Each structure stands twice: as structure tokens, then as C-alpha cells.
């Protein structure tokens, strides 16, 4: 029944019973695990009926006033609504404990530590992308305020029968941009070919470095998206040097402050918000190994590791190795140094298990998602390795959607 | 599109469909509801007689006489053995295949790509403790060929109903013995400290050093188990020492070459052999990463750090990783400048995707499992990190079993 959770390190054992109350199934099978891929391969009344008055339950018990007077009319309210209309609406409290939930149950979050403060921003009297715009630059704002990053998430309009999608058609509000050459190669993100190119065909005049901020395409329900450039001033960025090589700076690299994903759903009681960006601070290896480090990446292994003069010749000598701690090293002293939130891997990992022992205690469990858990750099250096974890997914929930082009 | 699982890798954006799943008859742990493919540990006749059945199935199929009279009539030879005595004995080359396959099935195996090339030695004739030493004597000089490795496996006699198995205690032919101290830590290897006390139990005057190599504990059906001591001369070791840091010599560190698990099950068409210990080569992270660095094994991070004169007050220093790369280092440029067999975790990885091809084209997929085919260290840097893998059960296997005491 309950599944047996050890920690190899320290030999501790718990009972995960939280992953009882998951509604939704994931993609393995007795026959068999498919636990490290990446993605997966009106509504009805009754359905949605459901969710809601489990997600109203569940905010009632939050508050301490399960089963109270204000509990039954609320439940009431939502039955009304859903019965004559076919869905419902979330008032904000309900919306910002909602939020938080989504974080607190992400399998692959590591820094959920920080689940219970977030700022949450109300979005969803937004009526046009002009209107979009001027809240996601103000999320920017507060959330980067001036290198102090504080968590947040804007909420935007919720899915509706048979109309369009809010949609931020960019993966993150802050990327860089990837231009195609002739030969094939890639100048800036490689990741971002794709929107780059979209941004270029809605009208944008495109830069021809490798960290050019892109502009956000912004799309209200059944409308072409509209293409907004973000105020250079809003966009913190980070040049990266290093503590003791002193021609790292030279290399020209930096990276932005804020990491803000946009592409996600969050799904709260059954009701479906397809824009709602988020935001909370870097853990060092997102940058340092996997955005400058990963070979579809920028790449960047071979060019350090031969300023360092190692010897590339062969593997055996792991100059990737030394190179990648230098690197990641870069990046922690860069954000020190520009006085920018950031949080390095071991800490990290650290403040995880913390979150681990809390959510036993809280609610019996905790779904995490090893391979995303542990960090792509020094993962046995780390707490996390050593620790089982059990995947699954509980509502509130954020969730993959399709692009919207 | 294809009713089989959809495996991508992220580097390269290829995708290819496993459909070698489809021939798992046993159940893994994970369901649609939650996964545990993290966790480390999640006769009737008529049920020996089907796996007997698939077994030789999967023999006749290996040789190209599926369906043929001979097939047919070897399996009329194991229902009639099975009907008679209750189980059932294979011919020499069946065991052969049988073991290959168990190697190749194997779904933690970075070393697959050598699966083909293993010999194996049948001891299925022994009678004795004293003549399962001899055996696996000659197993140790044979694999260990003075620094030139080679793959191999010894199987002794199957379990067989209402007697006693054959079972070595030893968790690996050679492993490094683990004291518990006064103060309550261990001098040697933490992870050895019951099979030291058990060698101690049954007569054996224990040494007081970090790397005292263990004297084998065999037992033969239905009787306690005897101790053995192997000659030092058979036992290859590599003294370790660093290409730039000259002061590492000095720390007196020190690791066997020959890496031989001893306490696994070998399952072939429902026969179980309890006792068959298997022997490949070293991967550099097993013993620089994992043996030497490990919080609860010898733990010498701090150690080496502070030789290194790192800052080991602050997570950001990355002091853990610096010197883990070190570590793993010595251990590379040891083993080569001793001439004895070793692959780094680039190179395996690297040549764990060629195995990955070469099983598409052959069989349709390659269970595995990422948690332990991704190297402790440096993983994203490896290819292996961004290749999507399926995990499942295929027979003939390697399994885990209790230990006998
Ligand atoms: C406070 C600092 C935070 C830290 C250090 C942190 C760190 C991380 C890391 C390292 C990842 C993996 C990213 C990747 O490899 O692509 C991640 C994923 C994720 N985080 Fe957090 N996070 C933080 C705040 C937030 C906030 C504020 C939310 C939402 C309210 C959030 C929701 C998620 C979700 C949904 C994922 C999975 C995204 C995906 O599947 O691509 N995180 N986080
Ligand atoms: C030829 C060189 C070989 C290399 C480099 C290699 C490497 C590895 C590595 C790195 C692991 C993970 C070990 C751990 O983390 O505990 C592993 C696991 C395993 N290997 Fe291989 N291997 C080789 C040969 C063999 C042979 C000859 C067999 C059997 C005939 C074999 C059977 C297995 C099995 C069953 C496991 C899983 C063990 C467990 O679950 O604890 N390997 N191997
Ligand atoms: N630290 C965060 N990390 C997640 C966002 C950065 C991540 N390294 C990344 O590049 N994510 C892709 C994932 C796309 N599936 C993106 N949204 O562009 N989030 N945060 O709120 O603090
Ligand atoms: N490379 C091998 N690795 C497996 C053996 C060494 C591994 N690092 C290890 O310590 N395995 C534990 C497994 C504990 N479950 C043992 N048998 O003592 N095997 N080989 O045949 O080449
Ligand atoms: C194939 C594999 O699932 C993939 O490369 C995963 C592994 N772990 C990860 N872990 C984190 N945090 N982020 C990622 O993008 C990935 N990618
Ligand atoms: C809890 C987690 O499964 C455990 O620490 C695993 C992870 N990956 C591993 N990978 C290998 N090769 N060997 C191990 O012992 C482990 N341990
Ligand atoms: C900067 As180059 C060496
Ligand atoms: C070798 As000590 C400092
Ligand atoms: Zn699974």
C-alpha cells in the first residue's frame, strides 16, 4: 500500500501515505517505469464538480474552518455556478492559497522550501496582450527588485469553453535570442531558435549578438500575438567573471537575474489558468552546467577548458569536470559579487531535505522527482542522491501544455 | 503513432520507440498512480515449467532453430525432467546464452556494450566449500589476468528442493574490512562492518588497518559456512596517487582492481543460481565518487579538501566538487600507470549509447535505469543524462536476494 521510503546515507525510513490522495496518473506501469522522460505522451459537470468542491475542501481545512458556515455556502456557490453556467470562479483568497499549493506540490521543484511565500498577483480582470504586458513588467519589477529576487506569480484569465487561450508564448519572460546562420550553426540560445524566429516573423528587428533579450509575443483569446520589447531597464542581467581567472571575464558572458517559466498551466480545483508566469530565484547549475554547459547549449566546455590549458585530448584527463566546477564557480561569484539572489547546489539540496523531514510531518509525504531533484553536476556530493523519493501528482497542480503555435 | 513507449533524446532530438517491453513477464514497482523508480530495493511446477518453456524459447530463438524438431524435443526433455524430479538442469551452452543475457538484461549496467564477451566458467559440479575456494581462486586469477581484466562469471550449483543452497556471504570477492571503534566510528569500510564481525564470529584474526583486505565466507548446502583467506599475491591493488598534486601519495589511499559482486542471484528459465559471482572492470566514479567519497562510506572529501587548502566553511566554495574531481582523477591516472583495466565515466557513458544503438537495431530497446546508468558525478556532461530511458524486468536476470545469515 504505502510505499517504503529509505535514505541510504543516513539509514532513516518513512511511509509516504500522501500519494493517496493523487487523482491523476502518471506514465508508468507494473510492466514498466517510464520515470525519466521529460513529457507526456465544457468539461464534464460531475468531473469538474468533483475537483472543485475537493479544492474548496481543501482551502477550508487550510484556515482551520472545515465543515463552518462559510465552508457550506461557499460549497453551495460553486454548485450553483457550475450547474447553470458549466464552470465556476475562484475568489482571490481561494486563488492565492491555490498558487501555493501548485508550488508546493511540483515533483520537480527543489525549492520548495520557499512554498509558503509567494506573491501573488491577480490578473484576471486583464482584457488585452497591452494589458498582459503592462502586468507581466510589473511582476519583473517586483519580483527582481533590484537583485532582492522575491517569488511570484501572475495570474492571467482562466480557460473557457469553446474561446482561445491567454497564452505567453515565450518559455520564459526573460531568454535569449538564437539567430540561424548559413552552415547551420547557431549564434546566442539554440534553444530559442524556434521563438526567435516567430518574433522575427511578427515584426521584430532582431540584434545579431549572443545575449540579446527577446521580446514577449503576447496573445489574447483568438487573436494573433502581439509583440512587446521589454525595457532594457527592467532586465537585470549578471556579467560573469571569475574569483581567480582572470581572463574569464574576457569570454564576454552573463546571464539574466530573473528566471521567470511562462509556458506552464496552473490548474487549481479543475479550472485551467493557460498564462500564469512564475518566478522565484536561480540554483547555480541551471546556468552554469546546464545553459552554458549543455553541448545543444551554448557550449561553451572546450573554449574554458582550453583557456585553463587543459588537455582535451582525452576524456581521462576530465577536463569537462574542471572545467564545469569552474564555470558554476563563475556564476556563484558573479551573483555574489552583482549582490543578486542565487542559491548553489548544495545549499540547495540541503534546504530540500529540509522541506522533506516539514512535509512529513505536515501531510505524510512529499512527491519529488529524483532526476530532477538531483543536480547535473556532483549529484552523490549532494543529500538528495542518497534519498528515495516517490513521484506523483496532487491538485493544485502545474502542468505542460501544448505550444500554443 | 506507435503503441510502444516514446524514448527522445534531448541533445540530438532523436526518437525511437522500445518495443522490447512487450516481452517482460514480471512486474516492476512502479503503477500509474505513483513511481518508485528511485528506490533501490522496491516452486510450483506449473510455474517453473512456463518460465523453463520462455527460456528455451529464447535459446532456440538465439541459434536460429525456432520451431525446429530439436527445439521441440528439448522442450519434451525439461517437461518430462520437470515431471519426474520437480525441476530441471541445463545443457552447458544454455548456461552460456543464459548468463550473456542476464548481463545484457541487466538494467544498472553502464557496461553492457562488452555483454557478448563473457566467459563463463561451469562449476555446477561442486560438491564442497573447500573446492568453491578453488573455483573461485581460479575465477580471481583469471579475470584479473595482472592488470589486464577480463569479463567472467562462475556458476555454481543451482537451488535445489528441500536442500540448502550455496551461497557466498561476501558481498564481492574482494572488499576491504570495516571496524567498529570505541567512539563508535569505523576504521576501514562502514559499509563492511557486518561481514567483518561475521568473519571475526567464525575464527578470523582481523587486522587494524583502513584497507585489510576480507577473507571469504563460503558455505556449501546444509552446512555452516567455512572461512577462507586468499593469498595476497592474487589479490591485484593500486596504490593511489595524483598527475599534479604530489601529497596525495601520501594519504596512503589505496583500491583493489578487481571488482566482483558475489551475493546476486542468476534466474535462468525459473533455475536459480544462488551462488555466481560475475567480474567486469572498474568505472572511475565507483571508487573515486562513491567508495572513497560517499558521507557513510570513507568519506575523505574533508580530508583531501583541506589538503588542497579549499574554503570547507561555505557550501559556494564548491569545495566538495573541486575535490571530488581530484579524487576521481587519482584514481584514473593510478589504475593506468599501473596497466590495470579502467574506464572513466565519459568513455563508459559514451559507449553505453553505442550498446543503446546497437540493442534498437537488435532487439527493439535496452531496459535501463537512468538513476544508475547517469554517472555521481559530472552527469549532464555526459551523454547519458539526456538520453530518455525505459526501465523493465527480462529474464534471464540478475536479482537481488536475502542475505543468508
Ligand atoms: C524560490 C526559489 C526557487 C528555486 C531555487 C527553484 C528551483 C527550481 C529548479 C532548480 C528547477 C528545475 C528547473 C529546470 O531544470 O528546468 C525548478 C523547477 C520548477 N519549479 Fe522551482 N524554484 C524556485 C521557485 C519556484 C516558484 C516561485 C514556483 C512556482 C510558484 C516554482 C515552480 C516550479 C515548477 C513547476 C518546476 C518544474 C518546471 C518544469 O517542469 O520545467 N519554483 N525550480
Ligand atoms: C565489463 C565491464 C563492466 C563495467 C565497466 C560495468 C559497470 C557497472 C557499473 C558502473 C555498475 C553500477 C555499480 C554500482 O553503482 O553499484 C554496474 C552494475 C551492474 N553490472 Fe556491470 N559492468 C561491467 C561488467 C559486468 C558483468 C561482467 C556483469 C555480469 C555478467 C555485470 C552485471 C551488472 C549488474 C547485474 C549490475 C547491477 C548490480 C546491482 O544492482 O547492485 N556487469 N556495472
Ligand atoms: N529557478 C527556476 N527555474 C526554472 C526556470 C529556469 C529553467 N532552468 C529553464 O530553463 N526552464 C525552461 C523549461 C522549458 N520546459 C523554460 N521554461 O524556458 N525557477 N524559479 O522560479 O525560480
Ligand atoms: N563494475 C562493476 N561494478 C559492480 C561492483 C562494484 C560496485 N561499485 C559495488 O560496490 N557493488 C555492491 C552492490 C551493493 N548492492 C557490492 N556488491 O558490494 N562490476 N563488474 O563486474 O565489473
Ligand atoms: C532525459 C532526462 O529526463 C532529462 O535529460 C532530464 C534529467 N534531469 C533533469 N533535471 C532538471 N532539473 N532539469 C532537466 O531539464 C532535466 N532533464
Ligand atoms: C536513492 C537512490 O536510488 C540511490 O542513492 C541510487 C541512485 N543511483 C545509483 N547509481 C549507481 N550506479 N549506484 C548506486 O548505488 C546508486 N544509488
Ligand atoms: C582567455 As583565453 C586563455
Ligand atoms: C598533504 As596534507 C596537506
Ligand atoms: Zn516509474
Redesign the interface.
Known amino acids: 500500500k504505502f510505499?517504503r521510503?529509505?535514505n541510504?546515507?543516513?539509514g532513516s525510513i518513512t511511509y509516504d501515505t500522501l500519494?493517496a490522495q493523487?487523482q491523476q496518473?502518471?506514465?508508468?506501469?507494473?510492466?514498466?517505469?517510464?520515470?525519466?522522460?521529460?513529457l507526456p505522451?465544457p468539461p464534464p459537470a460531475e468531473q469538474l464538480l468533483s475537483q472543485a468542491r475537493d479544492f474548496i475542501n481543501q482551502y477550508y481545512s487550510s484556515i482551520k474552518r472545515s465543515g463552518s458556515q462559510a465552508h457550506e455556502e461557499r460549497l453551495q456557490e460553486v454548485e450553483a455556478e457550475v450547474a447553470s453556467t458549466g464552470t465556476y470562479h475562484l475568489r482571490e483568497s481561494e486563488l492565492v492559497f491555490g498558487a501555493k499549493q501548485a508550488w508546493r506540490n511540483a515533483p520537480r521543484c527543489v525549492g520548495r522550501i520557499q512554498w509558503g511565500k509567494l506573491q501573488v498577483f491577480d490578473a484576471r480582470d486583464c482584457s488585452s496582450a497591452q494589458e498582459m504586458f503592462t502586468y507581466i513588467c510589473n511582476h519583473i519589477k517586483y519580483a527582481t527588485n533590484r537583485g532582492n529576487l522575491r517569488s511570484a506569480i501572475t495570474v492571467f484569465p482562466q480557460r473557457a469553453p469553446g474561446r482561445g487561450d491567454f497564452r505567453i508564448w515565450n518559455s520564459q519572460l526573460v531568454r535569449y535570442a538564437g539567430y540561424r546562420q548559413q552552415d547551420g550553426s547557431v549564434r546566442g540560445d539554440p534553444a530559442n531558435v524556434e521563438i526567435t524566429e516567430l518574433c522575427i516573423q511578427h515584426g521584430w528587428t532582431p540584434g545579431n549578438g549572443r545575449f540579446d533579450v527577446l521580446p514577449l509575443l503576447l496573445q489574447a483569446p483568438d487573436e494573433a500575438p502581439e509583440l512587446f520589447v521589454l525595457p532594457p531597464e527592467l532586465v537585470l542581467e549578471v556579467p560573469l567573471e571569475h574569483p581567480t581567472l582572470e581572463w574569464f571575464a574576457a569570454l564576454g558572458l552573463r546571464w539574466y537575474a530573473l528566471p521567470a517559466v511562462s509556458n506552464m498551466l496552473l490548474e487549481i480545483g479543475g479550472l485551467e489558468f493557460s498564462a500564469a508566469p512564475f518566478s522565484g530565484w536561480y540554483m547555480s547549475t541551471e546556468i552554469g552546467?546546464?545553459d552554458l554547459?549543455?553541448?545543444?547549449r551554448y557550449n561553451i566546455?572546450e573554449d574554458v577548458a582550453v583557456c585553463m590549458d587543459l588537455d582535451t585530448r582525452t576524456?581521462?584527463?576530465?577536463w569537462?569536470?574542471?572545467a564545469?566546477?569552474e564555470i558554476?564557480?563563475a556564476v556563484?561569484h558573479s551573483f555574489?559579487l552583482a549582490k543578486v539572489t542565487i542559491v548553489?547546489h548544495?545549499?540547495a539540496t540541503?534546504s530540500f531535505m529540509k522541506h522533506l523531514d516539514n512535509e512529513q510531518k505536515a501531510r505524510g509525504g512529499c512527491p519529488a522527482d529524483?532526476?530532477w531533484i538531483?543536480?547535473?553536476?556532483?549529484?552523490?556530493?549532494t543529500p538528495v542522491?542518497?534519498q528515495?523519493?516517490?513521484?506523483?501528482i496532487l491538485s493544485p497542480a502545474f502542468r505542460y501544455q501544448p505550444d500554443p503555435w
Open positions: 510505499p521510503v529509505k541510504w546515507e543516513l500519494c493523487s496518473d502518471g506514465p508508468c506501469t507494473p510492466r514498466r517505469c517510464l520515470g525519466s522522460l521529460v505522451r552546467t546546464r554547459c549543455d553541448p545543444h566546455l576524456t581521462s584527463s576530465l569537462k569536470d574542471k564545469a566546477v558554476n564557480l556563484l555574489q548553489d548544495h545549499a540541503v529524483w532526476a538531483v543536480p547535473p553536476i556532483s549529484g552523490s556530493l542522491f542518497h528515495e523519493m516517490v513521484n506523483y
